């Protein structure tokens, strides 16, 4: 029932999911001006050098790129993290038009899109589990800007013919995903939520200050995806993002500046 339309959309789902309201919601404006340096952070440590991505598919409301969880593959730890979480999948949040589309805003910015790694404490031992706790998951967010091209993002491009419309899936082997990080790993970070329902507030944010740029075309081909099923009628999936939700009683500590 949930989704992106003026009927089921982000001010809906409070009604299926209560939690929607809750004291540590995702996403958040990160206002830069406010933002604690916190000099005892450390850098954050992204090892995808072993990364084994199986499979990408359209769920409806974004695509998914899933990855091998099995093993310590692909891991994110440091950074404001205790100990070692798996990369299980990432996708993306965009907009209809290029100033919309990013889920946290910077000075109330928004970007056009942004990209969410997902991963999840090895402690907890499987991604269900690890939903179910407040430190379970991290989840490095990562804007996209319209601008040149980001030639490791388009393999991903390239298959989204392939899982237009919800439900559909493809084979979806060797992509790297150190092709879609920016330069620089300086970062934002909080604790908060999953930005779609069941909206758990299982997250350590890690949002990096550093945009990646991606093209016009690219970005324009996300936006032939459907969020129906290949059955139904067109719906252009298009704006599947949450607005920022209030900080409420929390502090974005910064890694730099
Ligand atoms: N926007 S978010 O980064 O906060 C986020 C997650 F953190 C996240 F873990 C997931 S996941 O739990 O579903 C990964 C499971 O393999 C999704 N969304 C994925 C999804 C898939 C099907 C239906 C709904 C959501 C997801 F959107
Ligand atoms: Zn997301």
Same mark, same amino acid.
Request: glycine share 8%; net charge neutral; with cysteine.
């Given at each position: #029932? @949930? /989704?992106?339309?003026?009927?089921? =959309?982000? *001010? !809906?789902?409070?009604?299926?999911?209560?939690? %929607?309201?809750?004291?540590?919601?995702?996403?958040?404006?990160?206002?830069?001006?406010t933002?604690?340096?916190?000099?005892?952070?450390?850098?954050?440590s992204?090892?995808?050098?072993?990364?084994?991505?199986?499979?990408?598919?359209?769920?409806?409301?974004a695509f998914?790129?899933?990855?091998?969880?099995?093993?310590?593959?692909?891991?994110?730890?440091?950074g404001?993290?205790?100990?070692?979480?798996?990369?299980?999948?990432?996708?993306? #949040? @965009? /907009?209809?038009?290029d100033?919309? =589309?990013? *889920? !946290?805003?910077?000075?109330?910015?928004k970007? %056009?899109?942004?990209?969410?790694l997902?991963?999840?404490?090895?402690?907890?031992?499987?991604?269900?589990?690890?939903?179910?706790?407040?430190?379970?998951?991290?989840?490095?967010?990562?804007?996209?800007?319209?601008?040149?091209?980001?030639?490791?993002?388009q393999?991903?491009?390239?298959?989204?013919?392939?899982?237009?419309?919800?439900?559909?899936?493809?084979?979806?082997?060797?992509?790297?995903?150190?092709?879609?990080?920016?330069?620089?790993?300086?970062?934002?970070?909080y604790?908060?939520?999953?930005?779609?329902?069941?909206?758990?507030?299982?997250?350590?944010?890690?949002?990096?200050?550093?945009?990646?740029?991606?093209?016009?075309?690219?970005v324009?081909?996300?936006?032939?995806?459907?969020?129906?099923?290949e059955?139904?009628?067109?719906?252009?999936?298009?704006?599947?993002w949450?607005?920022?939700?209030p900080l409420?009683?929390?502090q974005?500590?910064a890694?730099?500046?």
């Amino acid at each position: #029932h @949930w /989704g992106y339309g003026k009927h089921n =959309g982000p *001010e !809906h789902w409070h009604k299926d999911f209560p939690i %929607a309201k809750g004291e540590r919601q995702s996403p958040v404006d990160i206002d830069t001006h406010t933002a604690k340096y916190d000099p005892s952070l450390k850098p954050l440590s992204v090892s995808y050098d072993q990364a084994t991505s199986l499979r990408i598919l359209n769920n409806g409301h974004a695509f998914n790129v899933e990855f091998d969880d099995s093993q310590d593959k692909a891991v994110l730890k440091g950074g404001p993290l205790d100990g070692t979480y798996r990369l299980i999948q990432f996708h993306f #949040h @965009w /907009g209809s038009l290029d100033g919309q =589309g990013s *889920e !946290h805003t910077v000075d109330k910015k928004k970007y %056009a899109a942004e990209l969410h790694l997902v991963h999840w404490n090895t402690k907890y031992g499987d991604f269900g589990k690890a939903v179910q706790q407040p430190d379970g998951l991290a989840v490095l967010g990562i804007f996209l800007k319209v601008g040149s091209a980001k030639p490791g993002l388009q393999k991903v491009v390239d298959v989204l013919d392939s899982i237009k419309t919800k439900g559909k899936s493809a084979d979806f082997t060797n992509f790297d995903p150190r092709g879609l990080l920016p330069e620089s790993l300086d970062y934002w970070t909080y604790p908060g939520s999953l930005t779609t329902p069941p909206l758990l507030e299982c997250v350590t944010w890690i949002v990096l200050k550093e945009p990646i740029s991606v093209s016009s075309e690219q970005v324009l081909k996300f936006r032939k995806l459907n969020f129906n099923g290949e059955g139904e009628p067109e719906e252009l999936m298009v704006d599947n993002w949450r607005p920022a939700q209030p900080l409420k009683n929390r502090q974005i500590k910064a890694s730099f500046k």
